[PDB]
Scaffold this active site. Structure first.
Site, mmCIF file in Angstrom:
data_model
loop_
_atom_site.group_PDB
_atom_site.id
_atom_site.type_symbol
_atom_site.label_atom_id
_atom_site.label_comp_id
_atom_site.label_asym_id
_atom_site.label_seq_id
_atom_site.Cartn_x
_atom_site.Cartn_y
_atom_site.Cartn_z
ATOM 1 N N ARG A 245 0.842 -1.185 0.000
ATOM 2 C CA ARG A 245 0.000 0.000 0.000
ATOM 3 C C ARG A 245 0.879 1.237 0.000
ATOM 4 N NH1 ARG A 245 -2.979 2.384 5.111
ATOM 5 N NH2 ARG A 245 -4.789 3.473 4.251
ATOM 6 N N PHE B 19 1.497 10.592 1.421
ATOM 7 C CA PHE B 19 0.957 10.155 2.697
ATOM 8 C C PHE B 19 1.971 9.191 3.309
ATOM 9 C CE2 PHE B 19 -2.494 7.428 4.871
ATOM 10 C CZ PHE B 19 -2.153 7.979 6.101
ATOM 11 N N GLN C 192 3.432 1.585 2.940
ATOM 12 C CA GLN C 192 3.214 0.606 3.973
ATOM 13 C C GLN C 192 3.577 -0.791 3.543
ATOM 14 O OE1 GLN C 192 -0.706 0.751 5.491
ATOM 15 N NE2 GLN C 192 -0.658 -1.346 6.310
ATOM 16 N N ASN D 172 -1.677 -0.570 12.480
ATOM 17 C CA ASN D 172 -2.430 -1.453 13.361
ATOM 18 C C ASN D 172 -3.870 -1.587 12.891
ATOM 19 O OD1 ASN D 172 -3.997 0.796 14.474
ATOM 20 N ND2 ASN D 172 -2.246 1.244 15.803
ATOM 21 N N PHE E 68 4.729 1.544 8.443
ATOM 22 C CA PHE E 68 4.588 2.445 7.341
ATOM 23 C C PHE E 68 5.588 3.583 7.503
ATOM 24 C CE2 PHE E 68 2.241 5.904 9.352
ATOM 25 C CZ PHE E 68 1.614 5.293 10.423
ATOM 26 N N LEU F 104 -2.464 11.067 12.943
ATOM 27 C CA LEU F 104 -2.147 9.706 13.349
ATOM 28 C C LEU F 104 -1.549 9.667 14.761
ATOM 29 C CD1 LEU F 104 -0.613 8.507 9.983
ATOM 30 C CD2 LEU F 104 -2.927 8.194 10.806
ATOM 31 N N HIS G 224 -1.046 5.611 16.319
ATOM 32 C CA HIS G 224 -0.011 4.702 15.828
ATOM 33 C C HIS G 224 1.292 4.979 16.574
ATOM 34 C CE1 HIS G 224 -2.325 3.073 12.385
ATOM 35 N NE2 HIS G 224 -2.922 4.252 12.425
#
Lengths: 164, 4
Positions: free
Chosen positions: A54, A59, A62, A101, A112, A121, A125
């Protein structure tokens, strides 16, 4: 003291570059060790050969799902899922290495690398490290993702290990 | 899905 691990990235076999990270074991030891251990493969399983499944340009990138390879797998060296050590560190910019997660206390092996400041975030995270070298190998990777994460070419951690 |  703070371990340094590296990833040799490959785009559909064609080697791209090396990205090394400094893991902050001084403030997030359990999470740093899990990543380190998984990077060396000293436990019989790890990141060598897994893909970054991903990638959302601007951004993050991951990866880490070495079991199902689609974001639904992964296991820590402590079992399948360990707790969130703390949220002392924040997503202050690009290069920040953080744990992906499925909500509170479900850390496994997925992570990531932020290619942008991602304050939203913070507190959700666990941040545990940062890119030491090859930040623009991470940037160049954005080139093979898409707004919805899907990737064109297969981006793999061709090799990885511990440097220091 | 996370990070969102």
């Amino acid at each position: 003291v703070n371990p340094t691990v590296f990833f040799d990235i490959a785009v559909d076999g064609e080697p791209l570059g090396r990205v090394s990270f400094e893991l902050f074991a001084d403030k997030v030891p359990k999470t740093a060790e899990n990543f380190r251990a998984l990077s060396t493969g000293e436990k019989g399983f790890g990141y060598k050969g897994s893909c970054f499944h991903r990638i959302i340009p601007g951004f993050m990138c991951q990866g880490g799902d070495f079991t199902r390879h689609n974001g639904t797998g992964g296991k820590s060296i402590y079992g399948e899922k360990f707790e969130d050590e703390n949220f002392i560190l924040k997503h202050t910019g690009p290069g920040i290495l953080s744990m992906a997660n499925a909500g509170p206390n479900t850390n496994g092996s997925q992570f990531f690398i932020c290619t942008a400041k991602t304050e939203w975030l913070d507190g959700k995270h666990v941040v545990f490290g940062k890119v030491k070298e090859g930040m623009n190998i991470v940037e160049a990777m954005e080139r093979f993702g898409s707004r919805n994460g899907k990737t064109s070419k297969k981006i793999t951690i061709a090799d990885c290990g511990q440097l220091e | 899905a996370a990070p969102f």
